[PDB]
């Protein structure tokens, strides 16, 4: 019927822009001439209406048309993807995971990583985007990848980190053999991917571990930034739903069909793929 969609600012999958003075979104076309489909998304800037568009917004529109449901989009209040944390005896999820489980949202449409920890409590669709984890550095920084000694034997001289309360945070938390790296990162993890990426350009952060679908995009736009080591881990983004959702089956069937008929290729070319510097 009327689903409460939660998403997060994460270019190129979700763009967040102010509305115009009259409260609508400015008409705009892509570099290839296709109309940019923009929806009103409320969130923090108190709550204010804003304009959302991108890969994940195109996906939401396709899903709402195929399965014929209406929606309202808002941005996650804490700005996080979602990890499970101990309450000052029980456990609770933050971020978009927390809003989905609490009822503040009925469906997560975002670059949301599919992992075991989240799948224990929610339903993931089949992946609408296959990708992985890589490392972003300022052009000129030399590291082999995730096995570099400046990462495996960290210090206060070479600072690396990821985004707080995210899937990468989970990935380095669960493996006891990664506790040395995680102990360094938790001293430096950032609130959002954008601030982390900005810190690399400012030489305040020396390496940013994040999703390759995002890092490679940022590298194609900002030529002072490069990726290195390539995919040391492979993961996929999926739609987030509660286990009781009646849309579970048709969302995954729709995503599979969209891969097969080239619809995802259109989105990947329009939003994700760009020329190297």
């Amino acid at each position: 019927t009327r689903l409460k969609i939660v998403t997060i600012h994460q270019e190129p999958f979700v763009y967040v822009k102010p509305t115009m003075s009259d409260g609508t979104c400015k008409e705009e076309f892509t570099v290839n001439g296709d109309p940019v489909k923009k929806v009103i998304c409320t969130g923090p800037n108190h709550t204010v209406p804003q304009c959302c568009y991108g890969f994940c917004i195109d996906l939401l529109i396709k899903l709402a048309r195929t399965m014929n449901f209406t929606y309202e989009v808002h941005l996650v209040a804490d700005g996080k993807f979602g990890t499970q944390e101990r309450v000052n005896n029980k456990k609770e999820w933050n971020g978009m995971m927390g809003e989905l489980l609490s009822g503040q949202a009925d469906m997560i449409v975002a670059p949301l990583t599919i992992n075991n920890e989240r799948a224990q409590y929610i339903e993931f669709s089949k992946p609408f985007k296959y990708q992985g984890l890589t490392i972003l550095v300022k052009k000129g920084t030399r590291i082999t990848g995730i096995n570099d000694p400046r990462l495996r034997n960290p210090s206060d001289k070479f600072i690396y980190a990821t985004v707080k309360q995210s899937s990468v945070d989970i990935y380095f938390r669960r493996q006891v053999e990664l506790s040395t790296m995680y102990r360094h990162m938790e001293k430096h993890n950032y609130e959002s991917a954008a601030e982390a990426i900005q810190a690399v350009r400012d030489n305040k952060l020396h390496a940013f571990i994040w999703d390759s679908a995002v890092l490679e995009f940022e590298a194609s736009q900002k030529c002072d930034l490069v990726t290195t080591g390539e995919l040391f881990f492979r993961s996929g983004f999926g739609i987030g739903m509660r286990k009781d959702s009646p849309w579970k089956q048709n969302v995954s069937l729709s995503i599979l069909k969209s891969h097969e008929n080239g619809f995802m290729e259109d989105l990947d070319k329009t939003w994700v793929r760009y020329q190297e510097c």
């Binding site: 799948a119 296959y130 996929g236 069937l253 891969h259 097969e260 290729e265």
Partner: protein, 279 residues
């Protein structure tokens, strides 16, 4: 009993490798018992069950799942078909064994698609695949959506590329890039082996086929002269998944176990063990 599962698989090196029982009458080393209904001839339904030994990338996954999900199984090789097609409104292959309740789940190089997902449930993918491209090292093409493939006549000399007919790859190309399909007919190959020879001998510029298969052939190519495109340019991305009966009580536990293996690094160990070559 409710905890002993009938599981169907398909011989397909290196995902599933079939051997004879050694001498004893048991399976040793890293193999597991699997039976095969071997036909008497090619013009009959008569046959005989034969005890075999199965091993491989998918078998190790099954051993991981049996240990973690805590279930026992009787493994058998499908005989009517391969992976599964809908022939005369009837599903054959591994999909058929699951749809018609002869197997609780199917383990193998089984591609997840929309068509099959309507009759069976698929687990989370444990290996990424899709439509990829393999060329001789040096040739410049992106993925399937490259203009050099969609409009080969726009370039001189035009690219020479094909696939294996009557497969999933040709079926997709026929539906999505009609002219590319028409162009490919005079460049199609008997199989994977005859395609790689065409690339080496200069008779073919590109070979378009299943992503996981092309990557496996590229990593063990003699001379390392054949390379595949990057994963970011794979078309119609999907994965190999475990098929189950719709509404199966095992799908939830299978998914969590598979996602655990990807997070543990056990999956990477199996990829290095069975799928990675010397290139």
């Amino acid at each position: 009993d409710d905890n002993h599962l009938s599981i169907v698989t398909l011989e397909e090196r290196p995902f599933v490798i079939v051997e004879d029982i050694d001498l004893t009458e048991t399976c040793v080393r890293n193999t597991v018992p699997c039976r095969k209904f071997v036909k008497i001839n090619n013009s009959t339904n008569e046959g005989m069950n034969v005890k075999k030994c199965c091993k491989g990338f998918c078998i190790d996954i099954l051993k991981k799942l049996s240990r973690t999900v805590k279930f026992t199984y009787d493994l058998y090789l499908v005989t009517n078909g391969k992976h599964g097609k809908k022939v005369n409104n009837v599903w054959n292959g591994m999909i058929g064994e699951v749809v018609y309740q002869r197997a609780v789940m199917a383990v193998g190089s089984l591609t997840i698609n929309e068509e099959r997902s309507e009759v069976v449930d698929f687990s989370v993918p444990f290996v990424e695949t899709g439509i990829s491209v393999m060329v001789s090292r040096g040739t410049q093409v992106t993925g399937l959506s490259d203009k050099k493939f969609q409009r080969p006549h726009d370039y001189s000399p035009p690219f020479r590329f094909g696939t294996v007919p009557n497969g999933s790859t040709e079926r997709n190309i026929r539906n999505n890039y009609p002219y590319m399909h028409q162009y490919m007919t005079r460049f199609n190959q008997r199989g994977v082996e005859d395609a790689l020879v065409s690339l080496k001998t200069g008779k073919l510029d590109a070979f378009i086929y299943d992503a996981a298969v092309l990557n496996y052939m590229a990593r063990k190519d003699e001379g390392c002269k054949l390379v595949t495109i990057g994963s970011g340019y794979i078309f119609a991305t999907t994965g190999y998944g475990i098929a189950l009966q719709k509404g199966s009580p095992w799908k939830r536990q299978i998914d969590l176990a598979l996602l655990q293996f990807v997070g543990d690094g056990e999956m990477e160990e199996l990829e290095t063990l069975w799928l990675t070559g010397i290139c």
